[PDB]
Structures are given as structure tokens and as C-alpha cells.
Design a protein around this ligand. Structure first.
Ligand code: MG
Ligand code: MG
Ligand code: MG
Ligand code: MG
Ligand code: MG
Ligand code: MG
Ligand code: MG
Ligand code: MG
Ligand code: MG
Ligand code: MG
Ligand code: MG
Ligand code: MG
Ligand code: ZN
Lengths: 25, 60, 155, 120, 84, 83, 84
RNA sequence: CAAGGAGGUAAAAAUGUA
RNA sequence: CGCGGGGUGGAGCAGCCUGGUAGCUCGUCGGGCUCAUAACCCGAAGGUCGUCGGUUCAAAUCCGGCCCCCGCAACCA
RNA sequence: CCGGGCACUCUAACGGGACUGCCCGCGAAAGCGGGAGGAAGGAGGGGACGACGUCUGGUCAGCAUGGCCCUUACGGCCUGGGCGACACACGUGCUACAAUGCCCACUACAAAGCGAUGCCACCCGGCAACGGGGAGCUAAUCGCAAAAAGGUGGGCCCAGUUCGGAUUGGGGUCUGCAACCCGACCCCAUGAAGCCGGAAUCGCUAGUAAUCGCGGAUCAGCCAUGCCGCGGUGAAUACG
């Protein structure tokens, strides 16, 4: 999980958004 | 090199990122706060003396 | 822990069965404080018991605990400047906690795929008498009769 | 089935089968599958020869792969070296290039621990 | 009696220069007597123990100890600074 | 790296030197301190010197070193092994 | 790399210590450069022969020279005073 | 109940920075 | 200028007879226990087997020349 | 969402509320065990507080300060480098070795905090970082945030494998005059070592250990996995 740049929990652990976790509820 | 640096910190120009906030009471470059302009040590010295309005001993 | 009897915790009884002994096992499943999953693994496993034998899944649980519960255990002692290891009888609070630990510890050592199937087969094997934890029980019980020379160091 | 030069995935999902080729990861695999029109749940044990030849034509007419992609990476590293670049000389010693910490752990790049005696 | 300067020793001797010339004049005094009487003389020259077995120390100041070692032809200096 | 929207190659000193030098000619030696600068193709063919922290090491420019900086070709440290 | 001072070299180093101060830093500067590169660097590092085979000199000043010699992990300074 | 008398001992574990 | 034996990791030894993988201890280096050292515990490196030539598919090992060390013998007269 | 009420929840100031006052037993008393009594009780749970003094402990680099030393300089300015170097050794940690697990999609529940030389709702371009527009908010008004674990549905079937993410190539965004040493992100392809750790060693007795996210300080930006605080689920055991 947590450190992988191409997953959901990785973007959560960073606080960044991307393709793998975009900005929309 | 102490006093020339404090008055390098007072002057504004030449690429604004070269400005670093600094304590005016002692002249510390680190752990200086944007709320007061004091260092973290001058903060405690005056706050225990009572020269800080509203600052109290926090406890919870 | 020098002053008091560092008193025993009381638990809330179950919401499908109403007992302390099942909730203790829900807590012994629990890794990283997930009780909703810890109850789910146990409740999937009870359905596995429900359909792999025609017997009530609480009644196999009680006897699987009693078939794994040790009687005597060997412990180390220091009186006279010597370190031998002395057998002594076990308190039923500790007999419960050790059997409750040994069932989940042996079920994690089972090679089956899902978690609930490991738990269910462990209960089926312990109640009938051949689980991985009854091996641990009888080995722990083997050392006390083996070291029965030292039970004159009882207290 | 042998696509890029490798066959190796026998019964498994086809997007997984294309991730098993140097040059195609998960994104290029799903791009090739949404192009071709194959449900990824249809495994590589059961798929039409026409789907196989369309998939192969796409994945090795579109991008550069296993042998040539390695040749391009090696040529770019050889171009980074032999010119005197900082990153080229870090590739030359076998040191990391992206401003990392070498006083401590950089052992993936450095290799195994070569423990040297150390007076005091 | 040739002088041998170890890395630590010469780095410190470069530190007593540009900090304190009194220490440099004291060290040159102790070296001038060690070159003449290696196991007697000035600065209480004592034989050393366990972690520095085979060494000798002359007092520079109340803390500072000049740690030297002698051969037939030469003179090692392991420190011209701190209390061992 | 940099953004592409704005004018890349920030420096003017060696640029106002070399734009005289490439059109006048005669391949001269130029010392600069601009390690932050992009090798833009009129610089190809020249021998310029870059400061490393100690001195001015000359670099030779040919057509493959373009999308880089000058500090990439002026090594600051000296390692030479371990012993 | 450990420093080796001979008899006369140490006395002449003390000779520059007592009289003029500016040369002593220049001397230590020259020792620093021959420590990182033994035969190259500052002040024309020059070889000698025709009694001095295996010995090298540098110039401290316009008349006096800093001669030396090297072995595996040592730096011997024979003189830091006038050549001849 | 209040307490003495004779008697089995703890080990295998060294050193000190001048 | 007779006879016998021996040159192997830094030190001390074994392996050679019967040629295919050089092993043991102390020591060295990294770590652990201690305030620290020693003791103790975990882990690792280190020789090409005096030297030259030959035999063999292959030499520490078999053979020959030489250098060094050790022991013995040198009597009759 | 309005009229209206503000009864509740919240917010906020001042109060009451346990002092083992009451009951039994023990005792000469202090006090101790148990119990209706209420929310709590025999310092309710946490903080703030930390004696005479020790370590001739640490800080002349927060500041002040005695003495010694340098003044065409041990002062002052600028550019570049450096504090980021790497054969190694140690401490603190973060991410993992997977199926009580991974990924995708949808749907919920917080507390404490921060902001108009900023937070940026909401649209458009965009695979995304982000960029263009432009509304609200001197802020229980508007924004930062949708909390994450959890629940449902689908896929992988234990294989270095959809675990894990190093390291490296290429293409970009943002800050800053500036990202070569030396930034943080986004995308593609690489996808290593690790399959649970020798001698040893550490923290925790109740919302505690474990697990999961969120906010702030510093801050143009950030090498933040650190610190400081906040809440979600929530063990085990204490014979001695
Ligand atoms: Mg992954
Ligand atoms: Mg700044
Ligand atoms: Mg010290
Ligand atoms: Mg002993
Ligand atoms: Mg002794
Ligand atoms: Mg030998
Ligand atoms: Mg006879
Ligand atoms: Mg008090
Ligand atoms: Mg100190
Ligand atoms: Mg630093
Ligand atoms: Mg670095
Ligand atoms: Mg406690
Ligand atoms: Zn201050």
C-alpha cells in the first residue's frame, strides 16, 4: 500500500491526488 | 557575524525569497514565529514575565 | 503489580449467543482492534460448523475449549539459589486463557485458505480430540508428569 | 500464446498476461484491451485466434518493446555517460543519480555490504 | 630524535595555532624536553595504562595532556589536545 | 524540471557574450559562473569554462549536450576512491 | 599521512614561529597541498638529483625552499629553510 | 501461648581511564 | 660437506604415505553484554602450501637439482 | 428552505455535585473490606506544579557577560560550491514480506485546528499534477476535507507472484530570478532486495497497547516517514 504512487492509499498517505485517486466525492 | 546579519534581515530587496524572518529581540534565525516576530526563547522569557497579552499557561 | 490482586476484567456477553467465553474468542481473533471482522470470521465459521456436522456450534465450542484446557503446567522457580522448573496446577482463569489462545494460535498454523475455515476445522478437530492445540495441550501436560520429581516445590 | 517474444502466461487474465511483458504495464495493457475490445475476465486459456492476432498487431506496431526498449534505455545511458554528465558519472561509478543519501542506505544501487575494517 | 605527527595530533596543533599561542609555546617546551630527556623532566611524564598501553603523557594544562610514544630514533605524538 | 510556458535558459551574461561570439566567430574561451544555464544550440562548438567552487574547468561543447545545465559538466567534488 | 620533521626542519619551523608570523601560515598551506597531492600543487614542486635522488622541493619564498621526500604513508620534511 | 539453645548457607563471575 | 627429518593463513600444528575438497586452535575484522576493559555470545575474511625443472588428463601430495632449519654419526690408529 | 419557537443537541460564563457524609464488620484511633446512594466515588481519569542539593552536567552558537586575541584584518559585501560528499559502523523511524491480505467502484460516521499580500466553493481544458475563469468568507456565515480503517458489490487464489515498492529511462506540472550538484508532485515503462529477521534489545496495566486517518508550527516551495495536538475501531494479561 502506503508508499505506492499508483494506488489509492499511496495518494492518501501523501495528501496528493492523481489519476489513481482524483478529486470528486 | 551577528549584527550585520540582523540588519540584512531588515532590508527588503534583491530577490524576495532571500528574505528570511528573524527575531528582533535577540536575532535568532531559527524557530522564529510569524505571529510575534520573536524567537522561541524570547517568547517564553516575556510570556512568563506577563508582557504578552492574553498568553496563559496552557493546560488540558 | 505489587500491591493488589490486579483484578479480572469482565466482558460484555455475545449479541447472538449471550456468553463471555465466545466474546473472549472474538477478542483473541482480533488483530489491530477490528472487532467487526473478528466477529465476522467466527460467525462465518459457525455456519461452517452448522453445515459440516449437524451439531449446535456453541456446544462444540465449549467442549473444544475443555478438550484443550490444560490441567497442570511446569513453571520455573528460584528458592535455594537453584533454577529448576516446577510443575503446579493451573487456575481456571488461566486454563481458559491458554486454551483460548492455543486454538487461534493453531488455527493460524493451519494451511487452509480462508480464515473462518481454519477456525471451524480447528473446533471440529479439538472437540473430537485431534486438533493442533490438543497436541500443544498434551505436550504441556507431558512436561509436568515428566518433571513430577520437582512438585515438592509446590506452593 | 506467444505475443511479444514471450508466451509464458498460460491460463490467467489477459491484462495480467500483457503486464508480464517488459514494456507494457497495467495502463498500456488496459489501453490495448479497450482498443481491441476484449473483456479481461476472458482468460488466455480461452480466447479467439483473431483476438490474439489483433492484440499482437496492436501491441507490436504501436510501441517499442523488450529488446528494442532495452536497447533504447542502454543507448540513453551510454549517451548520458561518455560525455561527462553528472548523472552519467554516477551511472559510471554505480552510484544513485537522483540526489539521494549515500552516507546511509543506498544499497540497492551500491550492492551488498562491503564491510571494511574501520580503525576506531 | 625525529618528530612524528599523526592526523589528529597535527590537526589539533593547527588548532592550538590561531586559538592559543600560549599552548603552542608550552607544547614546544615539552617537546624540547622530551627530545632531551624522554622519560623524565617537565610536565609530570607518566607511563600510561590499558587503552593507551605503550604511551606516555606530559601535562600541558590542568586538562590537556600531550600523549607521546618513544622509539630509538623517533617520537610519536598521538595528541596535543584533550584529556585522553 | 522547469515549466515549458516561460522562457527557459535563465542567464544573460554568457548569452550576450556568445551571441557576439558566434556571429563574429573565432572560437574563444569564456569564463562564467552560470551553472544554472541551458546549453542552447548556438553554443555548440565552443570551449567555455565553468566554476566548480574552486576553479574554472573548461568544457567542450558538441551537439549531444543540449538539454542540460553547465553544472552537469563541472564536477564539484573529488572522490578518487577510498585508499 | 603522518608528518615527519627532522632535527633541523623542526628548529627552522620554530625559527619562523619566533620572528615573522605570515610565513608560518604559508608553510602550513604548502604542507596541506603536498598532503592531498604529494608531487603537484602550489609553488613549483621540483625534483632534485646529483646528491638528492628521491627528494623533492617546493619554494616557500623567492630564496628559501621547502624540501621534502615521500614514502608510503609518510611525509618527511628535511628543511623549511635556505637551499644550501 | 509467649521464645532460646545447638547447625545446614548465598555463587561461578576479574579489573579500573592517568 | 656422511645419514635421517622438516619448510603450509600473522603464531603454533595437522593434511603428503595411498595426487582431485587445504582443516584445528589462538590471533585479525564487523556486531552483541558492561559506565568501560577483559571474560563470554553471534557472524566473516585470510594461505596457495621454500624455490626451479620433470611425470601425469590433473601436483601441497610422485621424482630430481638447489637454498634454509633441526637431529644423529665422525670410530681403529 | 421560510414564518416562528429556541423545548433539545451544540456553544459559552458562573454554579451545584462526595467529603468514604450513610449501613455492616474489624480497630484504641488513623484507617481498611463489602453495599444499596447516585454519572462518578475511599486521591474519578488526565494534565499544569516538580524541595535542600548532586552530576565543578549542557548552553560564551538564543541573548547578556569578566578576561585573552584579530583590526587594510578571526571585520564587511557579492558569485559559485558546501552543510546533501561514501569502502563502512550505530541510533531513531517509515514502507513491506501478504488472503484477519491486495486492487477497483459506490455509500456513510468525527474531533481539534487554519485562512481574505489567503482558504478557494462551482464550471471549462486536462489520463493527472495543474492551468484558465470566477462566486462566497474580515469568518460556529464561506472554504480547507470527501474523514481513513469500516459497509456493500466485483476481480486475483497464495505463486516473488494484481504482495511489495526500491533503482533507473522518458514526458510534463508548480514554487522560485533561479531545481546540475540539491526540491515536491503527476503520467508511462521499469518493477530489485525482502517469503517475517542471529547474539541481543524496546514500549505498553483500560480507551491503555495495537491499528487508521485529520489539523497546525516552520513555510515562496520542500527533501515531514520528524515534532506537536486531534479523533475512528479497539485487545490480551497481571498466579506472584
Ligand atoms: Mg503495488
Ligand atoms: Mg525562506
Ligand atoms: Mg572527550
Ligand atoms: Mg573470571
Ligand atoms: Mg590487570
Ligand atoms: Mg610458520
Ligand atoms: Mg673397537
Ligand atoms: Mg502539588
Ligand atoms: Mg561541552
Ligand atoms: Mg547537516
Ligand atoms: Mg548526495
Ligand atoms: Mg503504570
Ligand atoms: Zn528572540
Amino acid at each position: 500500500g502506503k508508499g505506492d504512487r499508483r494506488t489509492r492509499r499511496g495518494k492518501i498517505w501523501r495528501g496528493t491526488y492523481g489519476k489513481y485517486r482524483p478529486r470528486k466525492k | 557575524a551577528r549584527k550585520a546579519l540582523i540588519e540584512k534581515a531588515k532590508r527588503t530587496p534583491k530577490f524576495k525569497v532571500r528574505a528570511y524572518t528573524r527575531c528582533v529581540r535577540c536575532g535568532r534565525a531559527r524557530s522564529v514565529y510569524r505571529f510575534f516576530g520573536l524567537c522561541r526563547i524570547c517568547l517564553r522569557e516575556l510570556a512568563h514575565k506577563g508582557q504578552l497579552p492574553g498568553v496563559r499557561k496552557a493546560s488540558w | 503489580a505489587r500491591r493488589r490482586r490486579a483484578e479480572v476484567r469482565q466482558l460484555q456477553p455475545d449479541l447472538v449467543y449471550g456468553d463471555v467465553l465466545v466474546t473472549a474468542f472474538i477478542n483473541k481473533i482480533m488483530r489491530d482492534g477490528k472487532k467487526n471482522l473478528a466477529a465476522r470470521i467466527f460467525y462465518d465459521a459457525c455456519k461452517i460448523i452448522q453445515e459440516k456436522t449437524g451439531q449446535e456450534p456453541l456446544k462444540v465450542f465449549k467442549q473444544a475449549v475443555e478438550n484443550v484446557k490444560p490441567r497442570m503446567e511446569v513453571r520455573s522457580r528460584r528458592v535455594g539459589g537453584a533454577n529448576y522448573q516446577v510443575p503446579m496446577e493451573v487456575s481456571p482463569r488461566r486454563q481458559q486463557s491458554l486454551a483460548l489462545r492455543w486454538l487461534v494460535q493453531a488455527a493460524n498454523q493451519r494451511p487452509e485458505r480462508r480464515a473462518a475455515v481454519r477456525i471451524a476445522h480447528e473446533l471440529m478437530d479439538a472437540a473430537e480430540g485431534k486438533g493442533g492445540a490438543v497436541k500443544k495441550k498434551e505436550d504441556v501436560e507431558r512436561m509436568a508428569e515428566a518433571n513430577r520429581a520437582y512438585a515438592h516445590y509446590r506452593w | 500464446a506467444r505475443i511479444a517474444g514471450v508466451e509464458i502466461p498460460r491460463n490467467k487474465r489477459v491484462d495480467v498476461a500483457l503486464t508480464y511483458i517488459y514494456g507494457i504495464g497495467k495502463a498500456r495493457a488496459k489501453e490495448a484491451l479497450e482498443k481491441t475490445g476484449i473483456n479481461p475476465a476472458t482468460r488466455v486459456k480461452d480466447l479467439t485466434e483473431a483476438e490474439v492476432v489483433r492484440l499482437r498487431e496492436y501491441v507490436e506496431n504501436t510501441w517499442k518493446l523488450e529488446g528494442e526498449l532495452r536497447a533504447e534505455v542502454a543507448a540513453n545511458i551510454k549517451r548520458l555517460m561518455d560525455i561527462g554528465c553528472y548523472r552519467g558519472l554516477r551511472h559510471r561509478r554505480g552510484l544513485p543519480v537522483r540526489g539521494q543519501r549515500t552516507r546511509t542506505n543506498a544499497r540497492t544501487r551500491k550492492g551488498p555490504r562491503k564491510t571494511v575494517a574501520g580503525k576506531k | 630524535m625525529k618528530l612524528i605527527w599523526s592526523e589528529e595530533s597535527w590537526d589539533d596543533y593547527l588548532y592550538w595555532q590561531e586559538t592559543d599561542k600560549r599552548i603552542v609555546k608550552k607544547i614546544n617546551e615539552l617537546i624540547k624536553d622530551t627530545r632531551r630527556t624522554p622519560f623524565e623532566g617537565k610536565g609530570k611524564p607518566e607511563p600510561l595504562k590499558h587503552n593507551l598501553s605503550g604511551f606516555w603523557s606530559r601535562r600541558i594544562t590542568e586538562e590537556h595532556r600531550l600523549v607521546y610514544a618513544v622509539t630509538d630514533d623517533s617520537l610519536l605524538i598521538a595528541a596535543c589536545r584533550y584529556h585522553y | 524540471p522547469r515549466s515549458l510556458k516561460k522562457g527557459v535558459f535563465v542567464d544573460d551574461h554568457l548569452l550576450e557574450k556568445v551571441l557576439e561570439l558566434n556571429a563574429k566567430g573565432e572560437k574563444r574561451l569564456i569564463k562564467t559562473w552560470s551553472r544554472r544555464s541551458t546549453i542552447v544550440p548556438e553554443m555548440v562548438g565552443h570551449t567555455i569554462a565553468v566554476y566548480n567552487g574552486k576553479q574554472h574547468v573548461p568544457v567542450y561543447i558538441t551537439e549531444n549536450m543540449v538539454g542540460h545545465k553547465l553544472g552537469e559538466f563541472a564536477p564539484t567534488r573529488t572522490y578518487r576512491g577510498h585508499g
